[PDB]
């Protein structure tokens with residue numbers, strides 16, 4: 861019984877398995893947003909989001 | 910004889926003609942300051958964009 865897809869991958873930053881990585885990149889709409897060390901948007905060269 | 914001049918400006922402000930903004934001041938950065946760049950009222954911190 862093969863289990864490569866769902867078992868965790870040591871050869872990756874953070875031990876996130878293949879399928880959950882696929883989901884995490886399929887959503888890509890949260891864009892974190894949980895103040896991942898926010899307070900860095902003092903000088904908004906861009907459109908400030 | 911004396912030299913006399915009459916300064917006669919009319920009223921009601923509809924032909925707003927002469928006026929003066931004047932009192933152009935200096936600038937500050939990275940400081941909690943009130944800004945009046947062009948008559949706009951507001952406060953905050955100024956930086957380079």
Ligand SMILES: *[C@@H]1O[C@H](CO)[C@@H](O[C@@H]2O[C@H](CO)[C@@H](O)[C@H](O)[C@H]2NC(C)=O)[C@H](O)[C@H]1NC(C)=O
Nearest residue numbers: 861862863864865866867869871877878879882
């Ligand atoms: C379980 O399935 C995966 C599916 O990818 C297998 O991974 C492949 O392994 C072969 C072995 O040489 C590689 O050539 C392929 O490139 C791998 N697939 C991918 C997409 O890279 C894995 O080998 C299977 N498990 C076992 C024990 O064979």
